[PDB]
Amino acid sequence: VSKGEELFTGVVPILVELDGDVNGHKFSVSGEGEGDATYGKLTLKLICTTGKLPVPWPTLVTTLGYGLQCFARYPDHMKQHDFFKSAMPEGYVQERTIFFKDDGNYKTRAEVKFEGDTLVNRIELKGIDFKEDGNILGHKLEYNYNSHNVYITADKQKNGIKANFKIRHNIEDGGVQLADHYQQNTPIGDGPVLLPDNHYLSYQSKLSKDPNEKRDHMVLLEFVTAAGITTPGWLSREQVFVLISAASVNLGSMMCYSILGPFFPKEAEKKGASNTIIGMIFGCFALFELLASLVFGNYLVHIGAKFMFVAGMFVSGGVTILFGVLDRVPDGPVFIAMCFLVRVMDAVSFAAAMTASSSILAKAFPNNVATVLGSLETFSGLGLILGPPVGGFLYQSFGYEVPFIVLGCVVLLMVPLNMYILPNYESDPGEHSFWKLIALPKVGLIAFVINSLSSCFGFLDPTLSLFVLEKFNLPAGYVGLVFLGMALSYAISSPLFGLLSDKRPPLRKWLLVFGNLITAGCYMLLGPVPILHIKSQLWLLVLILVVSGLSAGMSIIPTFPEILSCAHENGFEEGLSTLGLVSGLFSAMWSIGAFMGPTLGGFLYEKIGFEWAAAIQGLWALISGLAMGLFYLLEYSQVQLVESGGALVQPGGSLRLSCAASGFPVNRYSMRWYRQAPGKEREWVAGMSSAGDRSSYEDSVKGRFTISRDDARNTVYLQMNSLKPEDTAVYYCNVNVGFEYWGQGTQVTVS
């Protein structure tokens, strides 16, 4: 707890200083930058104020980035344990002892102060016993940097923390240099101390050069995350306290939403609404809810979530009683400006509810994004299946009014109780264009899929009732429950294909494609041409509609994590505004499907029969699903490694291991081979340089291991002879192209 803790968020500009005396050589570096504690980024452009550096660049990165640890993104249960963020406006000091393996040493002292709004960093270091012909001063350090963990514990003897981290520097010969870092961090002031437990920090550092800076310089795009303590497995009551509200929002509305649909032919000719007017009801219900959801997703930050959400059903609590009785008055010169007062504010009532609710749902659970959406969907399905059987008494009470007062009282009494739930105040507006968000080709291709999936349901819903009268002849109340089977299958597909979509991320894309593919199948048997000579059996049509609902429910849910990852990976922000604009995107792309689908399908039904009228929508969805493979199966350039060749070993012998690559070429890159022993930490074994003329070997396997590379298939082989009983371990392959990427690794058991 501190006065500057709440002001620490947002951008905070940084001033960075450095003077240093390494091996009798004096130099100085100064620079500027900024970052965030909520985003976690840290961009620092450093320029040498002296000239040619007597040290390699990454050897200074560990004392210029890890010296600036005020910007640390901590998780929820770790927010108490912020010692670097404990007190900024006084300043703190950091003493680091840096050792190298069998080489010289660094000692540095760090003073950081906070004046006004900006942060000043002052570093001084002394470097002793370094050689010109060694690994360091020969400029043998490759201009890349890896990902390392920082292990922090606290001590109350000097009210501070002590930390350790070992850094692997890459070598142009191929090997690594181990930098031991011991940290003693204390605060200057006598203020309150926020003592951490045992925890660790994770880093992801970039290292690039801008050509427009003429002198010696570097650019850091460090990303720092935190972890360390296992969270309790129980669900917190504060997070239930919003999930109950979201469940009530999705549950109470759908009864009124489902009963207002077929209610309208009780008055459609009382109002004098001709087919042009009936058509413009659907036209307004499409386009006005497009515009409303779009402007809401644009201006969620400016309006704010509270009056967005708790009044989001107050207008729905108005439209549940707006149809109180409309057989009373002879709307004559009333109905000139009432046709957009019948169902348009119903549309913005349920567009304003779901756009906000999806955003506040997805904010609370980043680790379970698809699970809780599927949970609300299966709660919706359980509400929909048991929807109208409770009406067998109530609207026989005193007339035709009853479904719009008694349930209207429930909505009007449940609407003001949603005010306790939202504590959310404010975020930042989105800087990138929402048109630029759409103009990304990935959303530009999933848009057509989600419009097709909406068009399927929109065409099918007023079609089975007019179809099954002819060759099946079921009564009106029977027309419902087939459809209920579909809902049952959406329920079966609501969490089961959602929770799995949280487990394995890269499996979702093909899964989405698979959904679309089987969606094509589920209409080709729906209305078949009798060239296929299938008989209209009830059981086969029921089964193909159940697997239709299963496919639709399996394909609807992983749309939202896919577009979240699409917005995340392509350089947009990481916050509530991006989540809200993605939710409005989903709202608009769902709402346009009520206009693309039912119009042309209802036109072509009476024209060509519900065989080819179903077949045109089926082929439309089939082309919609087939379009996804052009962007997935042609640009599947995610970098990954495949390791194999490990099995049981007869002791004192010869075998081989291999690892192949995908996502990058090996024309200008090096590669490493690591080993994890049981119970002991990792250790560099082999290294193939970018040139490949030479290689680097561990001394314990020197003269025993042969590394080889085949450039055509991007395959790398490691062979040996006379294996040892200590060589029961798991081997990893490491590559460094804009991240430190590792493979899964495989086992060698010398038994």
Give the overall shape. globular
Class by SSE composition: alpha+beta
How many beta-strand segments?
22
Class of the largest domain, according to the CATH hierarchy?
Mainly Beta
The percent range for strand residues is 15-25%
Kindly report the CATH topology of the largest domain: Green Fluorescent Protein
Proportion of helical residues: 25-40%
Number of domains: 4
Oligomeric assembly: monomer
Subcellular location: Cytoplasmic vesicle, Secretory vesicle membrane; Cytoplasmic vesicle, Secretory vesicle, Synaptic vesicle membrane
Extracellular side: 261-276, 328-333, 391-401, 458-478, 532-537, 605-613
Protein name: MFS-type transporter SLC18B1
Membrane topology: Multi-pass membrane protein
In a few lines, what is going on in this structure?
It contains 21 helices and 22 strands.
Give an overview in words.
The PDB classes it as membrane protein. Keywords: membrane protein. It forms a monomeric assembly. The low pH structure. The protein is Green fluorescence protein,MFS-type transporter SLC18B1,membrane protein and fusion partners. With 751 residues, the protein is of the alpha+beta class. It folds into four domains: 12-227, Green fluorescent protein (Green Fluorescent Protein, Beta Barrel); 234-426, Growth Hormone, Chain: A, CATH 1.20.1250; 427-636, Growth Hormone, Chain: A (Up-down Bundle), CATH 1.20.1250; 640-750, Immunoglobulins (Immunoglobulin-like, Sandwich), CATH 2.60.40.10. Helix content is 38%, strand content 22%. It has an eleven-stranded mixed barrel. Strands 13, 15, 16, 17, 20, 21 and 22 form a seven-stranded mixed sheet that branches. It has a four-stranded antiparallel sheet with strand order 12-14-19-18, with no helix packed on it. Strand 18 and strand 19 form a beta hairpin. Helix 2 (237-259) packs antiparallel against helix 8 (344-364), helix 3 packs parallel to helix 8 and helix 13 (441-460) crosses helix 20. The longest helix has 34 residues, at 593-626. The protein is globular and about 100 Å long. The chain starts with 11 loop residues before the first strand and ends with a strand. The relative contact order is 0.08.
